[PDB]
């Protein structure tokens, strides 16, 4: 059958009945299953580990009783040094009226994923500069096995139960199992030394939480593995406006650096996300257009690979330039689109909604619509009111299978705009205050909120 798999051990896959789905609908189910907040939801997408391709949020999955498919729910959009523990590097936070990027469930989810990446060699270890470095990398792998084990024990409330082999990359395990007996026993013993030294001495001596262990591990993947958080795409045809054997290039996309490229053998910068105006897909060909009329065109394997590429650029654009807008119709997320058609914000903090009313909704009845910060089933309406002396009130709107109803009501509507028209014919009240709805203060292009990530390059 068709399943969405989780990297978390304690979690049952999603088993999908026959029917029609959106990738996004599935990612929403997935976040509910893994306790991922609406705020972190758009960091995740569906990945097919066999095809090596990501699904765009608007992709349709028609499931019958014949089809067999395994998708992984996976964190896709990533910002090096989100954790703030590398002092050589720009830190990366959300805007604030600066908060952390990840919620606790996202961190837990990422830890499971990162472990899987390391062991299954999706996150390949870096290459040695020397035999000395080679051994050094290998020791860092052992340390990683100590973090993994220590954390698993602190989670089950254990202490000294009773090896490293399943917690290190599989390629490296294979490598070690082919070395001489004394080598293999030496390695095992150094590992046992690290482990004992950590759990007796280091943990108590530094009050190390399961949270620090998760952070440390993921911060270490960044420096231990190759291009952690990057996606690299391979192409024959790369055309750039600014600038025989079939020549070969790589295009790399990262949250922190944007869209870079090189001759397949260092990286040239084409563009950060906010400078992009639009993206076009022509079968397998992708053109990325910048504000300065410069263009990158590239040709990928298939249209599905093109959609996977553009999903990524587009997701990072929403994260760094504009939370409410999209670059390419072909991968536009259905929720993004509908929100635009309805004047609705994403899960902005209440203070941003209030600030927008203090600026452009000064009269009684002016409102903001915003998705709830804590669940996926409700929209909030924030309204300017006055006593008889300006107040802000919040009213809950339920959304259930495309139906919209005020909280508690037996009356629902087939669209949000229907519900709003009906509400605009009433006198509303709460506490002592009565008023009628005036107009919607809609999302503005490029405005700043907690949905955006404040990276070095996003400041311009």
């Amino acid at each position: 059958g068709v399943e969405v798999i989780f990297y978390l051990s304690d979690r049952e896959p999603l088993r999908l009945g026959s029917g029609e789905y959106t990738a996004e609908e599935l990612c929403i189910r997935a976040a509910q299953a893994c306790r991922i907040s609406p705020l972190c939801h758009n960091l995740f997408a569906l990945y097919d580990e066999n095809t090596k391709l990501w699904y765009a949020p608007n992709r349709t999955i028609t499931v019958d009783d014949k089809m067999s498919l395994r998708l992984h729910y996976r964190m896709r959009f990533y910002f090096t040094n989100w954790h703030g523990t590398n002092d050589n590097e720009q830190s990366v936070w959300r805007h604030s009226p600066a908060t952390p990027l990840l919620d606790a469930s996202s961190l837990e989810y990422l830890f499971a994923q990162g472990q899987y990446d390391l062991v299954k060699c999706l996150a390949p270890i870096r290459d040695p500069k020397t035999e000395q470095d080679g051994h050094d990398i290998e020791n860092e792998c052992l340390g990683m096995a100590v973090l993994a084990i220590s954390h698993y024990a602190m989670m089950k409330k254990m202490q000294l139960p009773e090896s490293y082999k399943r917690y290190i990359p599989e390629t490296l395990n294979k490598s070690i199992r082919q070395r001489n007996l004394l080598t293999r026993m030496r390695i095992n013993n150094v590992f046992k030394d690290f482990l004992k030294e950590f759990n007796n001495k280091t943990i108590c001596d530094s009050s190390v939480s399961t949270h620090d262990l998760k952070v440390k591990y993921l911060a270490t993947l960044e420096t231990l593995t190759k291009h952690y958080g990057a996606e690299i795409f391979e192409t024959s045809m790369l055309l750039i406006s600014s600038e025989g054997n079939v020549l070969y290039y790589e295009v790399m996309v990262t949250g922190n650096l944007g869209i870079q490229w090189r001759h397949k053998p260092e990286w040239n910068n084409f563009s950060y996300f906010p400078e992009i105006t639009h993206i076009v897909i022509k079968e397998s060909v992708v053109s990325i257009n910048k504000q300065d009329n410069k263009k990158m065109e590239l040709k990928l394997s298939s249209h599905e690979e093109a959609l996977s590429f553009v999903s990524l650029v587009d997701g990072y654009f929403r994260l760094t330039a504009d939370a409410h807008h999209y670059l390419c119709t072909d991968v536009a997320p259905p929720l993004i689109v509908h929100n635009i058609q309805n004047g609705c914000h994403g899960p902005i903090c209440t203070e941003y909604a209030i600030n927008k009313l203090r600026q452009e909704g000064s009269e009684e009845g002016m409102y903001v619509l915003r998705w709830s910060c804590t669940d996926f089933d409700n929209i909030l309406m924030t309204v300017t009111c006055f006593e008889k002396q300006k107040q802000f009130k919040n009213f809950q709107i339920e959304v259930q299978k495309g139906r919209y109803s005020l909280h508690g009501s037996d009356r629902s509507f087939p669209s949000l705009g229907d519900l709003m028209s009906h509400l605009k014919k009433q006198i509303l009240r709460t506490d002592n205050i009565s008023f009628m709805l005036k107009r919607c203060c809609q999302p503005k292009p490029r405005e700043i909120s907690n949905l955006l990530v404040a990276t070095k390059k996003a400041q311009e």
Binding site: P100, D103, S106, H211, T374, N394, Q426, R429, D431
Partner: protein, 37 residues
């Protein structure tokens, strides 16, 4: 053999790196009365 950098937690703690999801926002009771013709 020396402890790997991965197990060293000696350097200063930085800002907490994740957020706790906030308690659901409290909402106001909404009363409706039809507008008069």
């Amino acid at each position: 053999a020396k402890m790997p950098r991965a197990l060293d937690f000696s350097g200063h703690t930085h800002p907490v790196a994740t957020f706790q999801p906030s308690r659901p926002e409290s909402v106001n009771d909404l009363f409706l009365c039809p507008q008069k013709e």
